[PDB]
């Protein structure tokens, strides 16, 4: 009766800061209750913990108070059979929001909306008598998104909040032998949810793992580890304090024993009752027990030496009562001196923010998508990850344990959509509920040796409950530091000047939380704190350039210890079309409101984790090797701290334009810290011309746990020569024709012929045979299709006229018209030679004037020459070169440059100088939000079908114009055009990417000089 | 329905940490909805604050579920008509408890007994048709213990804990037009009740105000203020920030000003929007302004310069929506480089602690009594008091503020009865609960300028929940130090070292949490704040020995600075007997269990105010005026710190043995920490002989605040000379005579005749004409009816064998039994002479030995000259000395010696010799516990009746025994014995108090000689 609906929902619990659980029991490490030692100590399963994990029954409803009665009774006619974990919005019953600061709900704390969908999830199950006769059994959400109430048997049970922690009930008295059902009755919006605005799709359910753990009566309540060190880690105290719960009988004893492998290393045993704490004792029901091990092989991302703790819970006969265990890294992290240090030597940080995010399954997280995950990261030289912005998937920790990488581990804690952003977080009526986000996090995940920071949050502002809440950790774990960003990044929340998209040299000066120049901000008078970005390096669609600056500050200076860049993948999630095709979708496409469109995507890698090309610059600019080149002499230094160069060669070699002339391969002797020289063979060196180029790669010979063998780790290549040509062409045996008519000029030659237009003034046609090439004349182009960067947050609606993309709008760019200013033929000796000049304007404004010269000569080449003239005062043009519309459509395409991958110009030290040959396919970019892409830098030669083209230019080539690009929303509705699209460019502005809000082009890499020049030689094999 | 007892009494919120309160509003300053600035101004009344005090009907029961659901809609037929605030237990219902430690309740957190104690008050009132219309009313508790839910008109409103601050409920929507009927449900125990384990009576119900309040729609919902300074305080800055609740429109306005009387002394006005406080903005809906204020007057506890600060929250067109306001004081509170400071220079705490207790009323305050206390602490030389241990009623911080005295405000968090005392405040779970009990306190008292520190809560030892506590504190203000003594007294919650009876130079070390001597505390290694003791020199009865070692410590060392006395009133309780006569009541005395009898009596006066003897002592070691004899000048030292010498007149004067021979007058003219010289009149010089004494007063000639004109305020004593008599007596015209017997020898000589028992060997009667004088023969004693000191936490049950009673039972000083060695007479030339030798002996060991003379001369007068041999190995005597019984029953009584009033040897200096003559009823102090008292050291000369006793000893008389009294339990049960009871010491040991619970009388004060030597005269007049 006061287990009715109508009861229980009275209270409103969900609109109630002040009530965040109801019944729950107390946060703790990881328990599976073992029975045996054995398993415990080989992480094998416990028959004490079952999984609640399948098929569920589950109705949705509209609000809470349509929930009827019955069900508490008994299952509904029209319940459907899901499937647990899952997010019902990935079900159909409502649509996910994608919404980042704005509240997905209407802000009137706490209250949250009447129309406040439900989800009532049932489960039918047995329970097995034995559980019953003595123990605890109990019942665990790991996750449940946002609220709920729980029933058993038809009785309530409790309430919880919290969407990314666990909730744990004791269902021992409710339970009955064999059949058993469960009532779990969740809340989307609750007023856990004004804590929970996180810039990722908004979703609800049963989202992580349901288990029940069966206890002893007296039992294992809690235990903590912890490690210390000697001067020179040559020898370490393994601290830990258990406690117990039940009754405390004097034949109660406790064994910690540390394994490492086979290999018992040290044990301990004691019972109960620890020492003197104040005047009024200890405690009874503890016990603390110090192992001492003598050289212990110490854990670290490089090396993640680990060993197994076993505790054991027994009777001093030698019976177990029962048994828990976890892994156990020994580690050291301090901040000394300004220096972040880990075992005594100062960290560098490579990493990534990375969210729990699967395209498919939408925030219910597997182990085989933990595992991807982490080993690509590894591949590719990152060293932790920050969990943005909540504690994460149990087992994450564990993995990272074990594979090796620094976490940063988050308190579910973000209020973003608050005015002012503290609102909340200074008012002491949110203090508990924050309080709790705060210390289960910490309880939990204490003991994993890969957690080397706490954080309290993110973006919700600088309160007094953030003080508080910093000083408990600090208090309850001295081991680790914390952070907080919010403020200003440099708070008295924070050990670390955390900030996120600070730049490298300006300051960008906000009122009240500016953000300087991170060189700048180390040196800001009484501040001594090392720096470390929480979030860099905006990751969204085509960007990352500028990233090598970031990378050499780092190298730079001691106090920049790194950072996290923000983000590992993509937040797009899959829909299916009219005929069951999949393609990806984002904000607002699941008529989503309010949305931020592409703004959930921003990762590094695409949702179904294939690689964005900016993953390479990356991997290259965090690779742990570094060199340099004197003489022939090869400089290697090595970026590990603990690590000897063991599974390490290097290739090297030579090759002149493309061609290779020497090769050697040699194995890397350096240890962490340290340098090795390696001399070179005498390089040949041949009287033709062109470059030559030394390219050195470290390989990865043996296999490891995340590479496989052979795995590239490291390179870099420099330009060791140039022979210059000074040879003039072998004079013509023919001599072209020109035949004037008033409407063109045309040469032939051969086969071949050309034509000009003279009312347009540039080459409308060309054939070779009988087969014309082009489907569109080859013209001048200054613009390009938008990226992500260029356009930012500028809307239809509300205009960011600051925006590069507003600007060029603006200004005519986009829609500037040509003006023949002259068009003449002139009769070589041995060519002819075409002269043109356009100008382009806009509203009489002369935007740009074009100046060229074609010759053609009895090769049948010809050569392009091109001025540019940009007025001073016009926005920067995005690019500056040519394009046109070929009819051929080839399988390859074969150059000469940068490459294999996409490059831009703030965005092209991963890429090396090269002949490189790839399908076409390979030469567009799948950027979910269509925009330029693909371009190639440094190029030199480039082959199309029977085009050649040659020169010093960067190009891109596909199917698609970049009108197209620029007016598709989606990838999957571009379509292919008729030929093939080139684009080459004497010139190219870069991508940018510091933030993706607000102009991050650093001025080196804005096309800024008002005359550019450029030549060309077009051609035929 | 769901407003059922049933429904609501359901979820057992008391016995629920996680549940503090349930729509409660949040906290704030004191407010009263002026609806006229004037009234604001003046603090007149305001009309929207009305009190519901008075009468209520009130019913018991034994448990919760015990309500009949009736009691939600209507009255009780059995209901009694009580009066509210009030504590039931004051009424009859229940008794209440006297527990120090020891929870009153069974330790099961958070459980709470079945059988708990529910008051059931209701209260019917009519409401105006007015308040409805617009506005919101509220209603509000300001102390409710321990728990309680709420009904309005049958419908439930909410919950709430924590027994020392308000509870606010909008009752806004629940209010019918005219009658109105509250149904309160007050919980005895709750799991708050955890978190309440203080030192006192443990009571509960409605025991502090009810009201109703009228605000507006649109108001002020917070204010605070703020008060900057400039280097030398020429210059102020008053700041005050002010939140808003409604809504916001343009036309509103803020106008703060300052006044001082009549004279406005600044003026603010602005609109709502605050400055830009991060990436999202600012406040909206609050302001804050700043008036500047040149040359303003300084508040302190020895001037409480006030100004009045007035809030008006109108339009702009000049309307006023509300007014609210609040005194401010000018000053600033700082710790700097190790010492504590008020306004720039370095505070002395006088101080006192002191508990909401009226022996009639039990823990309900009244402004009469708060009043009492203040006065007499001002009047007493006390400059602060520490609110021990909770939050006080709000009129409290008013009257310091107006009278001036520094209070300490103290968190109502105590948990001194867990194991270990950290239990509840190291979890976690525990946070939040005990967080609202800071925050709210702090949101309340902040504006008060008498609060010049925070503390955290007492014995609670020494949690993480205190470190995020007093983060949080230092965060929102930092005008103010925080203190906390729990866990050793100098953890890292605490800004200054603050111990409680640490002794002055010896050192209690005990695990843990030892308690150094405090001149050695401030010096170990990496120590640097200030020292001041949360309680020290326990006053419990027969106490304050030693209590010039302190003041002499804080004097020479700086970061000595003061400390808060324990305490202020005996925590004892009026009880009626079979004739409706009033008594004294304490621990167990209401049958209470389980109880620390009189544990609970402690304090500086008695519960009806008046002053125990140790008042004085404090007095004067506390005085403002500090002096120096060099010749015939005096130096006077004043230590005021502002304020100058201006209303102070010093007394001189001399005198021979209690004769006059000159007196003088003379102003002050000493500025705060200055110096005055005085020189007095060539002072007379008699030839007879005596003590020739100068004594000075330093008097109020006009009156205060809190002082009567002639007030007297300091005073000390000296020594000027001796002329020593020479002069041997006239040659006796008589001679006595001595009749022998077997039983005896007897002495005659005139009226007068001495006998003394041959067989026992004492004085046993004598005669003055046909009249005895003895009931008792003199004898030697050394015992005392043990002080509340002497016996410490010793029970019959649980005997504390260190306790000196203890030792001194043990050894057999109560029951030795004398031994006559020998006993002769002797006749002399002109006198006779009687000698005589006892041994007292226990178990054939001899204590003591005592050896006379007695010589009876012509003159009529005897002269006993005795000689004392203590064994070294027994332990020392509390005292050594004769007493006997006299027959007569005087009057007065006239001595020549320390005075006037109750004097020991550690606790004398208060005293003046002179010539006392007082009324016998004054020689007894009535230490509602029974002990040995009255003493008065240094006499020369004692007279009562007939008798004149002349030598140097100490002495007390009464009508009972020692044995009388040391049988007695309460001193209402004392009867007067036959005559007069006549103790007079050779010597007497000190009365120790560092501590009640250990021993306390410094070695000085012990009598651990060996040998004792003392004469008397005893004669007629
Ligand atoms: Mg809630
Ligand atoms: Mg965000
Ligand atoms: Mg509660
Ligand atoms: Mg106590």
Redesign the pocket.
């Known amino acids: 009766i006061t287990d009715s609906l109508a009861v229980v929902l009275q209270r409103r619990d969900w609109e109630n800061p002040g009530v965040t659980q109801l019944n729950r029991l107390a946060a703790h490490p990881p328990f599976a209750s073992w029975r045996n030692s054995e398993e415990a100590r080989t992480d094998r399963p416990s028959q004490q913990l079952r999984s609640l994990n399948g098929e569920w029954r589950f109705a949705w409803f509209p609000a809470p108070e349509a929930v009827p009665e019955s069900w508490l009774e008994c299952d509904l006619p029209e319940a459907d059979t899901v499937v647990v974990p899952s997010n019902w919005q990935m079900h159909g019953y409502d649509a996910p929001i994608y919404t980042?600061?704005t509240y997905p709900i209407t802000v009137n704390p706490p209250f949250v909306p009447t129309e406040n969908p439900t989800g009532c999830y049932s489960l039918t199950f047995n329970v097995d008598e034995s559980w019953l006769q003595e123990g605890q059994t109990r019942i665990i959400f790991d996750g449940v998104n946002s609220a709920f109430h729980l029933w058993c048997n038809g009785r309530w049970v409790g309430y919880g909040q919290d969407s990314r922690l666990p909730s744990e009930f004791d269902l021992s008295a409710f339970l009955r032998a064999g059949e058993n059902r469960l009532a779990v009755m969740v809340l989307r919006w609750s007023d856990g949810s004004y804590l929970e605005?996180?810039?990722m799709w908004r979703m609800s359910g049963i989202f992580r793992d349901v288990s029940l753990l069966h206890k002893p009566t007296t039992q294992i309540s809690d235990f903590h580890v912890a490690t210390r060190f000697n001067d020179d880690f040559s020898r370490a105290v393994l601290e830990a304090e258990v406690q117990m719960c039940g009754e405390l009988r004097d034949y109660l004893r406790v064994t910690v024993s540390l394994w490492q492998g086979e290999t018992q290393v040290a044990s301990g045993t004691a019972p109960f009752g620890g020492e003197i704490i104040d005047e009024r004792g200890g405690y009874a029901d503890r016990v603390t027990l110090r192992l001492n091990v003598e050289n212990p092989k110490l854990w670290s991302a490089e090396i993640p030496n680990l060993y197994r703790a076993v505790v054991e819970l027994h009777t001093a006969d030698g019976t177990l009562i029962e048994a828990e265990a976890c892994d156990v890294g020994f580690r050291e992290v301090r901040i000394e001196n300004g220096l972040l240090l880990l075992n005594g030597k100062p960290l560098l940080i490579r990493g990534v923010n990375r969210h729990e995010h699967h395209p498919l399954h939408g925030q219910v997280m597997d182990e085989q998508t933990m595992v991807q995950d982490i080993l690509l990261m590894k591949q590719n030289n990152f060293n932790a990850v920050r969990c943005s912005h909540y504690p994460n998937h149990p087992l994450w920790y564990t993995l990272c344990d074990r594979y090796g990488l620094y976490v940063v581990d988050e308190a579910n804690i973000?209020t973003?959509g608050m005015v002012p952003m503290n609102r909340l977080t200074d008012d002491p009526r949110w203090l508990p509920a924050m309080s709790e986000r705060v210390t289960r996090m910490v309880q939990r995940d204490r003991n994993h040796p890969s957690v080397i920071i706490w954080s309290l949050g993110?973006?919700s502002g600088h309160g007094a409950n953030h003080d508080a809440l910093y000083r408990w950790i600090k208090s309850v774990d001295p081991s680790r530091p914390v952070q907080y960003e919010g403020g200003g990044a440099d708070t008295t929340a924070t050990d670390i000047i955390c900030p996120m998209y600070a730049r490298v040299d300006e300051d960008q000066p906000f009122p009240a939380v500016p953000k300087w120049s991170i060189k700048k901000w180390l040196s800001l008078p009484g501040e001594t704190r090392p720096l470390i970005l929480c979030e860099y390096a905006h990751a969204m669609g085509n960007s990352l350039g500028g990233f090598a600056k970031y990378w050499q500050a780092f190298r730079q200076y001691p106090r920049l210890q790194g950072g996290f860049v923000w983000d590992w993948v993509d937040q797009s999630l899959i829909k299916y079309d009219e005929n069951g095709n999949p393609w990806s979708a984002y904000g607002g496409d699941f008529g989503d409101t309010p949305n931020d469109r592409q703004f959930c995507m921003n990762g590094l890698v695409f949702a179904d984790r294939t690689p964005h090309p900016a993953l390479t610059e990356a991997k290259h600019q965090q690779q742990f090797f570094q060199f340099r080149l004197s003489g022939q002499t090869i400089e290697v230094t090595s970026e590990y701290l603990f690590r000897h160069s063991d599974n390490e060669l290097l290739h090297w070699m030579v090759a002149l334009d493309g061609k290779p002339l020497a090769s050697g391969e040699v194995p890397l002797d350096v240890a962490p810290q340290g340098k090795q020289l390696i001399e070179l063979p005498e390089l040949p060196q041949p009287e033709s011309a062109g470059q030559l180029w030394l390219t050195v790669r470290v390989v990865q010979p043996n296999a490891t746990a995340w590479s496989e063998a052979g795995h590239i780790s490291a390179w870099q290549q420099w330009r060791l020569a140039e022979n210059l040509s000074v040879t003039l062409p072998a004079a013509s045996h023919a001599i072209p024709h020109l035949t004037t008519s008033e409407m063109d000029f045309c040469i032939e030659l051969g086969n071949k012929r050309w034509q000009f237009n003279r009312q347009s003034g540039f080459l409308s046609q060309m054939w070779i045979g009988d087969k014309k090439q082009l489907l569109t004349p080859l013209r001048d182009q200054f613009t390009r299709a938008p990226l992500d960067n260029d356009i930012g947050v500028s809307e239809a609606t509300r205009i960011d006229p600051n925006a590069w993309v507003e600007r060029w709008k603006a200004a005519g760019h986009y829609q500037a018209e040509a003006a023949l200013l002259q068009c003449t033929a002139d009769t070589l000796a041995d060519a002819v030679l075409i002269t043109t000049a356009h100008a382009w304007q806009h509203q009489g404004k002369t935007l740009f004037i074009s100046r060229k010269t074609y010759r053609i000569d009895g090769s049948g080449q010809m050569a392009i020459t091109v001025d540019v003239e940009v007025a001073s005062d016009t926005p920067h043009p995005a690019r500056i070169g040519l394009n046109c519309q070929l009819a051929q459509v080839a399988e390859r395409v074969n150059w000469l440059g940068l490459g294999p991958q996409e490059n831009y110009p703030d965005r092209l030290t991963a890429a090396c100088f090269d002949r490189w040959d790839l399908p076409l396919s390979d030469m567009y970019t799948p950027y979910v939000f269509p925009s330029e892409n693909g371009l190639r830098c440094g190029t030199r030669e480039l082959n199309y079908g029977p085009h050649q083209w040659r020169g010093d230019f960067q190009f891109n080539i596909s199917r698609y114009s970049q009108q197209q690009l620029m007016e598709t929303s989606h990838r999957h509705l571009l379509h292919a055009e008729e030929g093939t699209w080139l684009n080459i460019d004497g010139f190219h502005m870069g991508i940018g990417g510091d933030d993706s809000w607000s102009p991050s082009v650093s001025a080196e890499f804005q096309l800024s000089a008002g005359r550019y020049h450029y030549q060309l030689v077009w051609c035929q094999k």
């Open positions: 980042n600061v605005d996180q810039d973000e973003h993110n973006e």
